[PDB]
Write a structure and sequence with these properties.
Chain B: GO terms for molecular function: 1-aminocyclopropane-1-carboxylate oxidase activity; copper ion binding; L-ascorbic acid binding. This is part of a larger assembly, with five copies of chain A. The first copy, chain A, is α+β, with helices and mostly antiparallel strands and 298 residues long. In chain A, 34% of the residues lie in helices and 23% in strands. The interface between B and C is small, with 5 and 8 residues. The structure holds pyridine-2-carboxylic acid (5 copies) and zinc ion (5 copies).
Chain lengths: 298, 288, 298, 298, 299
């Protein structure tokens, strides 16, 4: 059963049990859903509606332009080198480009700014729960992530349109995320996101007004492997356009990333590096195995 | 024999024959095809190619939406405005290349429309630019393009691609499929095919030119029929008077009292929208 | 000015003028287009339509698989030994293989059979006009071409898909045709076929519902050089997929080919041979000079 | 310091810094000189000699004829409506008139033809360097310039003879060039060409065996203002006849010119138009401000 | 993208700060603005307009038709880029008035023109003082700079743009920037035609009854070190409508020294320092050529 965490149970004497659920999702799933997370359901509903309307208005034509430009009109053999995906990226931190994206509406930009700020505070709240579960001092992960200019925080807004031949192409090929903590607002009707657990692909179930959390490669390093970043993918379907609004809380470019000493006894197998060196490498090898990227930092 | 006019034959000895053919088509056919019209054949090929491919990606799967159907058109369409103001950069489903080509195509058809109106002026004995002046109104002529496809129909005898009507506006410049037929005009009690022809433009005159010419050039009924296989493309540009243009029979063409009304074009168009497939003649009477 | 012959003008006031024009193209161009040839325009439209749709359904992915098979994905330098071409061949005579091309529909197969029979009759009518212009007896060329089983007649169905860098690769390299008379139904929008005349490449202009005629090597031999087989090529372009349905009316395999004695005063420089010996040689050296193939038949 | 670019440094490990100099000149100067290009110094020396000898034999007459019919033999006061300039034009593309200029020698025409071909290839190589610096796809600008008949390429051969009172008249009044890329072989001793930069006229220094490059109005549109076409003029002097062999690589007549979409964020202030409409208008208003010509294309 | 209209009466009250900020925004971003409630009597504007239009009809219109005849502009076969479709005369007020020397004007027109020009000269100096305040300069700075030895130069260009059968062939007045200081225009309130270039588009300066159009010339661009630029403008013709134009030019005296104000120059200026009459002698010959070479020529 996929972990669903009720964050409102942290405000009372059920808080220890909630923390234990968070910790075991972090150790064994790499993913969990959160409900009662404090984000207004009214804000999620308009983010959802304006994301979908901005797709028809602005992204659908770019998407078909892409399928023509790569011959994906007609899928007669398996395509393992492209994602059946429509995306644009919004940067929040350290410097916002929200007011420079030309094709987004005023009210969409205002909703995205509010949504991004609330998710940034929720990311930092979640990192503190991780710290507590890890036996780290409060604020430890936030301070590691800061670097010189503060954390990097952006939002990937994706749609995975219907695919006539889902067997032939993935919406997004299997990978682990490079960063710190990932907070996903996904479609509540159209499924597609899957994680790999114990040798099976497991669906990340659509759930109304929920946020999906998962941990990236940097948290595997800092926890000395105690919390691993898990492989995940998006599969297409013939009917349905799955919406994806995923926010990435990453260390600053010059943050020093290393295994926390209190989590290391035997010499660590994980490297110590500067985050931007990891991200330069990751961009070119995102869909290749994760383990060579750690070795490359030594 | 359907009139085909070679516009390259206007510069010379050949001009009086050509002008006589244009006038004969305007009086008796209401339609004619033009060749050697100055539009680059590469631009037409790109327009045709991108129109057919945009139907593929953006219109065909929505068009998924036993007896004779007399109230629906078997048609997939979207509209582009050029004048007085263009919404070309606001149509969501069009690519940048298609948009750049339509803008170039639209400007050239606008210049050719005004050249054709000047040929009509000469044949009518009107001063050059007379029809363009009449069409201007306050904000200039209205000019837009209707991009249509008529997909194959299993039972073409049950439904028309587009029911019989006359066009409300001024002059219509049609870039139609050069293989798949379908457009027909009504002449002397017979439906006549408007023959597909490579790199040609089909011209026809609308209701506003019938008024201005005091019936000398009438707007002719036409339709699009479906067929069981073939998707006929249609890129049709409508050069119309401005909304507040005053439309009336040109005085030099009226010796009598005219049976045709004098009105403002937008009053004709508001009425036209609701009664497009009913008879033409009541729309003229309604303007008195 | 590229020769366009109106076959309706044989009926026959300008019939001498039409014949003189045919003769002048045969001597000086090696190519000419014919209009009003008797082939139903609706059959041509069906052939063109089904050929283009059969490419998209069956050849376009095979073509992209061949490109990556041969490394033409990257055209960083000139390719002089490959044609940027998708083709299959249909044999009509003496023995048809129309029923063995498996990915074609019964409608396409029935239309190609009707088209091929009409083109075979037009080929023989054209050969009789050449006979008259050359002063040969009626039916002379048909009789020479017959051999024991009759003429060889087949159709090459080609498409030349768009090429990102057309200056690196040809759709089909320069060559002369080995056979008798070639009847080409080519794309009426997309150009590409060129012939060499007076030291210049001249486009063979797309013309709707026209047939392009050219003379092959066997007619150069029979006419003792009076009608030469002309070099031609297909160039690619970056946008546009030129279709080509080209039918080859050739002598039978065991036909004896020699210069017609009434066209020879001075001893001929051309050989006398059996057609299949010429064809066995031609297959290996098609894109090398033509003149050594004549010498090799002595 | 006026930018001088060594093109031979593109073949090696200094190529990035060379590209950076090119991009800097394109953004901030609109002009740059190139050395170590492909042109043989002996070909430049012969072009220069035969241009100067062709002035004395053929153009000096037409120049004094010009001064006669305009009353410019004695300059009492300023002349702001004529250029103190002797010119003839050589067209190379899409069609050459080189063999139709009556008063040009056989060897001048052969040198002029070889020179033009090398400058045409250098124009296209330089346009690809701009593409790379702009982040556009390879060949982007050449493809935009092509239209139906290919680029327009011609050569303006000018001499600016000595002027008794240089204060009264310019060799060529201030203007921006209408076209794409301009490649100038100018006099290496007699100066005169100046550009306007930061509120000062700056000499374009004569330099042995160099080519001066500048960008025209069409590249400002395509780059959405990132590379502007800058005002330039030729001043006269009392002693010295400055030679000018200027080759203009322009889009084809029916080329569609518009800002490249990857260079546009907010709505562009630059129009989208067909090049020949720009040129019709430019011819009559060449020495009036540039900015109204862009406004006229909307 | 609304054309700026400034209510000058709002300077007398609690909204003076907001009004000054609007004026400053128009100076930086438009180079043009319209003013209302400017203090010129509406009845004087009406008489100027009436007498200007009647003086065209009786005295200028015959000359204009005769001007076309002499230049063969009866027949607009092709585009004319070197002639203005314009009927004009000029009135010099300062330093020396020639008003009593124009022969074909009535005494009533001459008296109204003298009164109109005096009020416009006072309004020009009031506006220059608003610019000074917005620029952080001392009160009277621009008037002092403009004075030279004999005071500012002030004249009025009285123009009509008669109907043109083929407007696409010829402009009423070709695109240019004005050479001088501040330009105060009383234009037709019905017939449009004046346009300015802003952000790559021609923008109509909309006719507005009893308004004055203000624009800044090349000299204020120099003095403000480019903070207020002189903007390109033109007059287009139409097939019917005769646009009237009464434009007054408040310019520095001939021997005035023009340079960027020292408090606006934190690093070396791209703008020259010169004497105004040298700029004007050059400008007369190159008025319809680009502006930027004229600044370079003064160095
Ligand atoms: O696009 C991704 O890589 C993604 C999105 C949401 C959650 C995890 N990963
Ligand atoms: O859609 C129409 O009404 C139409 C289209 C093309 C030509 C004439 N009429
Ligand atoms: O493929 C060929 O060699 C060919 C095709 C058509 C016409 C001439 N030659
Ligand atoms: O004659 C010209 O306009 C020119 C010549 C060379 C370089 C730039 N411009
Ligand atoms: O005549 C001019 O140059 C003018 C007239 C009015 C306003 C601005 N400029
Ligand atoms: Zn991911
Ligand atoms: Zn219609
Ligand atoms: Zn061949
Ligand atoms: Zn120039
Ligand atoms: Zn002015």
């Amino acid at each position: 059963k996929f972990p669903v965490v009720d964050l409102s149970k942290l405000n009372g004497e059920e808080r220890d049990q909630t923390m234990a659920l968070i910790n075991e999702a972090c150790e064994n799933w790499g993913f969990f859903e959160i409900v009662n997370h404090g984000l207004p359901h009214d804000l999620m509903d308009k983010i959802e509606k304006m994301t979908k309307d901005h797709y028809k208005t602005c992204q659908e034509q770019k998407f078909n332009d892409m399928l023509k430009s790569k011959g994906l009109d007609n899928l007669e053999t398996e395509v393992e080198d492209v994602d059946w995906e429509s995306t644009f990226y919004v940067r929040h931190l350290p410097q916002s480009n929200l007011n420079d994206i030309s094709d987004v509406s005023d009210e969409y930009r205002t909703a995205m700014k509010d949504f991004g700020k609330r998710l940034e505070n929720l990311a930092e709240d979640l990192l503190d729960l991780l710290c507590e579960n890890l036996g780290l001092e409060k604020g430890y992960l936030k301070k590691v992530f800061h670097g010189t200019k503060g954390p990097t925080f952006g939002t990937k807004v994706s749609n995975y349109p219907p695919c006539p031949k889902p067997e032939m192409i993935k919406g997004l090929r299997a990978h682990t995320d490079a960063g710190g903590i990932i907070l996903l607002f996904q479609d509540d009707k159209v499924s597609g996101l899957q994680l790999l657990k114990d040798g099976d692909w497991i669906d990340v179930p659509p759930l109304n007004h929920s946020i999906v959390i998962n941990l990236g490669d940097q948290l595997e390093v800092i926890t000395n492997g105690k919390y691993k970043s898990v492989l995940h993918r998006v599969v297409t379907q013939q009917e349905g356009n799955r919406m994806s609004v995923a926010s990435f809380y990453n260390p600053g470019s010059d943050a020093e990333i290393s295994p926390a000493t209190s989590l290391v006894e035997k010499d660590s197998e994980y490297p110590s590096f500067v985050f931007d060196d990891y991200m330069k490498l990751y961009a070119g090898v995102k869909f290749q195995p994760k383990e060579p990227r750690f070795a490359a930092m030594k």
